[PDB]
């Protein structure tokens, strides 16, 4: 049958021209499509982490959703998904404002279910550092670079003219040890992990406003709040298709609780993945 991840938000009340009672959903939701026949509207049911809703509603077709979206600018509708079995604990990528706090809280509050991978660096090992503990210390920039071009790293960067990178093997190492690897990385690492058959749980924290940002962090100035909100907008525009979920709240506590639940809901041995 056809199972789909919703890449956008749908509100019945907002849409006119519905043939039957619609089914309104949120981004990230998984929908079971009962009949795709009409070239306009589809009949689907919501798929919950617990059950499968006994209900039916009308959702716009992929075709319909796209014409509407394309009509504006001078396209995200539905991502077909399959249920897949995993032998590993999925990595976790939180993105958006407050993500760092959310990362710190997961590791602190649940040390057994969460952890950090060992990154690679070309920075010369200090006498007190142990290779394999702090970093995997690469003794050749040439080698480090060849590793990068060969896609050994899901992310790489520079600090004080030293190369740093986050290895796939290194992430897979925590994943197989039974912990969610908490990654501080950009939206680009998401696809690489997927390509690597390690499917991260990717959660974006979407600020409702600049005020929303300022309320959760009271020590930010207007300039900072403005900047923080503006980079969250482009982050969302760039990576949206690659998010497993998007969360909003009026408080950090509210956001955090949601991420804990989503991670829980996404942490089973069977997960929904793109069909390809």
């Amino acid at each position: 049958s056809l199972y789909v991840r919703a890449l956008f938000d749908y509100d019945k009340t907002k849409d006119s021209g519905l043939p039957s009672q619609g089914l309104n959903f949120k981004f990230g939701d998984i929908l079971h499509v009962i009949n795709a026949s009409d070239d306009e509207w589809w009949q689907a049911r919501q798929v919950t982490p617990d059950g499968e809703s006994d209900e039916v509603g009308v959702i716009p077709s992929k075709r319909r959703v796209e014409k509407k979206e394309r009509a504006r600018l001078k396209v995200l509708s539905y991502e077909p998904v399959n249920q897949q079995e995993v032998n590993y604990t999925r990595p976790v990528i939180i993105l958006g404002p407050m993500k760092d706090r959310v990362n710190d809280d997961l590791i602190s509050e649940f040390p057994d279910k969460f952890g950090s991978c060992v990154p690679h660096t070309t920075r010369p090992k200090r006498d007190y550092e142990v290779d394999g503990r702090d970093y995997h210390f690469v003794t050749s920039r040439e080698q480090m670079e060849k590793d990068i071009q060969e896609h050994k790293f899901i992310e790489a960067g520079q600090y004080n003219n030293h190369l740093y990178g986050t290895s796939v093997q290194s992430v897979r190492a925590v994943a197989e040890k039974g912990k969610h690897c908490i990654l501080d990385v950009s939206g680009n690492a998401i696809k690489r992990l997927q390509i690597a058959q390690l499917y991260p749980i990717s959660i974006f924290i979407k600020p409702k406003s600049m005020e929303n940002i300022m309320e959760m962090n009271k020590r930010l100035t207007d300039e900072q709040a403005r900047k923080t909100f503006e980079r969250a907008v482009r982050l969302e525009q760039e990576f949206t298709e690659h998010f497993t979920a998007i969360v909003q709240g009026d408080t950090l506590e509210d956001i955090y609780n949601q991420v804990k639940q989503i991670i829980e809901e996404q942490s089973g041995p069977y997960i929904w993945v793109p069909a390809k």
Partner: peptide, 15 residues
């Protein structure tokens, strides 16, 4: 730690 990772200038990577 890890401080250096906290601040990095990221590099674009090949497809």
């Amino acid at each position: 730690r890890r401080h250096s990772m906290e601040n990095l200038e990221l590099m674009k990577l090949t497809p």
